[PDB]
Design a binder for this molecule. Structure first.
Ligand code: HEM
Ligand SMILES: CCc1ccc(C(=O)O)cc1
Ligand SMILES: [Cl-]
Length: 393
C-alpha cells in the first residue's frame, strides 16, 4: 500500500538538485518508505504539518536524526529541548523563549542593524565579493558570538561544530563519519564555553544561567541549553542570509521591489526561508502504531519530514518555485511548527531583516560573476561560494 523508493535524500546527487526527486517523493503518495535507510517519509505539506503537530505520536525524545536513541547511544548528550518531549521539554523551552524574547530583541536591534549597514557599505567598497564568506558568514559572525557573550579565543570552532551537529542528524554516510571522527576539539571548546564563568554578563548565555534562580532549570541544565544556542543559532542564519542574497541575485525584479519599499525586508527574508529552507529535513520516531496517509506505521519507526519539499508543495503554495517577497508566507515550515517551532526565530528574522534592509537601501544590482559552489550537509542546504558584483545605489 505504501510505495517503496530507492531515492537517497542524503546523497550528493540529491543535494546538488533535490527538486525533481522531491516531486517524485510528493507524487508517489502522502507516505513513502525509503529502502536505502529503512525509514518512512512524508514530503507533502499536509502530512509534514500534521506530523509536526502530533508530538505524542511522533516524538523527539528518541532523536531528531536517523539514529534511534533507544537503540544506539547519541554522539553527544541529548539536547534538553530539541531532543525532548513534553513535559520535560516545557520549562527549558520557556527559558529559551524568554532569553530570546521580543523584549530581548529591543536590546540588540541597534547593534545588529548598525553592523549590517556597515558591512554592506564595506562590501560596496570592494565591489566583487563572495556573498558567502564575506557576507552570509561575516555578518552573523560579527553579531551573534558577541550577543551570546562569547570570549574571543576559540571562535574559529563555532561553524565547524555547527556543521558537525547538522551532519550528525543524517544517516551513517561518509559525510557523518568524517564529521564525528576527530570532532573532540570542536566539542571541548563548545562545552567549555557553555560554563557560566566563560559567558559575559548581559549575553544570551549568562541570561540562561540567570534563569536557574527561578526553578525553571537547574544549574546543571543551563550549560546544555547554552549548547543548544551554540548548535543552532549561527550556521542556519548563514545559509538563510546566503539564500536571500542568492534569490535577490537570481530574481532581479524582486530586488527592485525591495529597493522601492525597504519595509518588505522582513517578509523577503521569510520568503527566502521558505524558498531555500536551510533546514531541509528532520526526523520523528513513532510512539505507537499510527495511520498516516492511509499507511499503517508501526511503533518505534523513524519518520523523515522533508521540510523543504513541504514549502514547495503546489497543493499548498501557488507558484511554489517562484521567489515572491509579497507572498503570504505564514504557515511555511522552514522554522518548524508546533511545540518545537524554532525558539530562536526572532534572532534569525532580525539578522535577516536588517541585512536585506541594508541591501535594499544601498545596492542597485547584484550580479553573479563567478563560479557558484554548493555546500553539502546532511541537514542543511546552502552555498559554499557565491561570487557576486554589487552595484551601489
Ligand atoms: C534561518 C534560520 C533558522 C532556521 C531555518 C531554523 C530552523 C529550525 C527548525 C526547522 C526547527 C524545528 C526542529 C524540530 O522540530 O525538530 C528549529 C528549532 C530550534 N532552533 Fe532554529 N532555525 C533557525 C535559526 C535559529 C536561531 C537563530 C536559533 C537561536 C538563536 C535557533 C535555535 C533553535 C532551537 C533551540 C530549536 C529547538 C526548539 C525546540 O526544540 O523547541 N535556530 N529551528
Ligand atoms: C534546528 C537545528 C538545531 C540543532 C540543535 C539544536 C540543539 O542543540 O538543541 C536545536 C536546533
Ligand atoms: Cl558538544
Amino acid at each position: 500500500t505504501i510505495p517503496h523508493l530507492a531515492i537517497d535524500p542524503f546523497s550528493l546527487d540529491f543535494f546538488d538538485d533535490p527538486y525533481p526527486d522531491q516531486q517524485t517523493l510528493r507524487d508517489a503518495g502522502p507516505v513513502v518508505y525509503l529502502d536505502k535507510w529503512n525509514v518512512y517519509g512524508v514530503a507533502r505539506y499536509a502530512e509534514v504539518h500534521a506530523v509536526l503537530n502530533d508530538p505524542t505520536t511522533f516524538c523527539s525524545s528518541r532523536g531528531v536524526g536517523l539514529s534511534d536513541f533507544k537503540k544506539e547511544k547519541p554522539w553527544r548528550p541529548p539536547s534538553l529541548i530539541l531532543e525532548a518531549d513534553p513535559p520535560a521539554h516545557t520549562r527549558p523551552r520557556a527559558v529559551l523563549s524568554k532569553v530570546l524574547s521580543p523584549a530581548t530583541m529591543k536590546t540588540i536591534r541597534d547593534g545588529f542593524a548598525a553592523a549590517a549597514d556597515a558591512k554592506v557599505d564595506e562590501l560596496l567598497q570592494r565591489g566583487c565579493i563572495d556573498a558567502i564568506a564575506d557576507l552570509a558568514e561575516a555578518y552573523p559572525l560579527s553579531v551573534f558570538p558577541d550577543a551570546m557573550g562569547l570570549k574571543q579565543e576559540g571562535r574559529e570552532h563555532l561553524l565547524p561544530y555547527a556543521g558537525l551537529v547538522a551532519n550528525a542528524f543524517g544517516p551513517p554516510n561518509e559525510l557523518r563519519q568524517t564529521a564525528i571522527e576527530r570532532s573532540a576539539p570542536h566539542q571541548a571548546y563548545v562545552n567549555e564555553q557553555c560554563q557560566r564563568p566563560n559567558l559575559a554578563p548581559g549575553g544570551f548565555g549568562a541570561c540562561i544561567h540567570a534563569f536557574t534562580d527561578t526553578g525553571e532549570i537547574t544549574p546543571d541544565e543551563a550549560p546544555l541549553l547554552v549548547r543548544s544556542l551554540l548548535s543552532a543559532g549561527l550556521d542556519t542564519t548563514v545559509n538563510g542570509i546566503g539564500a536571500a542574497v542568492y534569490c535577490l541575485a537570481r530574481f532581479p525584479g524582486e530586488l527592485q521591489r525591495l529597493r522601492s519599499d525597504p519595509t518588505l525586508a522582513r517578509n523577503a527574508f521569510e520568503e527566502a526561508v521558505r524558498f531555500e529552507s536551510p533546514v531541509q529535513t528532520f526526523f520523528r520516531t513513532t510512539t505507537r502504531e499510527v495511520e498516516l496517509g492511509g499507511a499503517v506505521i508501526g511503533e518505534g519507526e523513524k519518520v523523515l519530514m522533508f521540510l523543504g519539499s513541504a514549502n514547495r508543495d503546489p497543493r499548498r503554495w501557488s507558484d511554489p518555485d517562484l521567489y515572491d517577497i509579497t507572498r503570504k508566507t505564514s504557515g511555511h515550515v522552514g522554522f518548524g511548527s508546533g511545540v518545537h517551532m524554532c525558539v530562536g526565530q526572532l534572532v534569525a528574522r532580525l539578522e535577516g531583516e536588517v541585512m536585506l534592509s541594508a541591501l535594499a537601501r544601498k545596492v542597485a544590482a547584484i550580479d553573479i560573476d563567478g563560479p557558484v559552489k554548493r555546500r553539502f550537509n546532511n541537514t542543511l542546504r546552502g552555498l559554499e561560494s557565491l561570487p557576486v558584483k554589487l552595484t551601489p545605489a
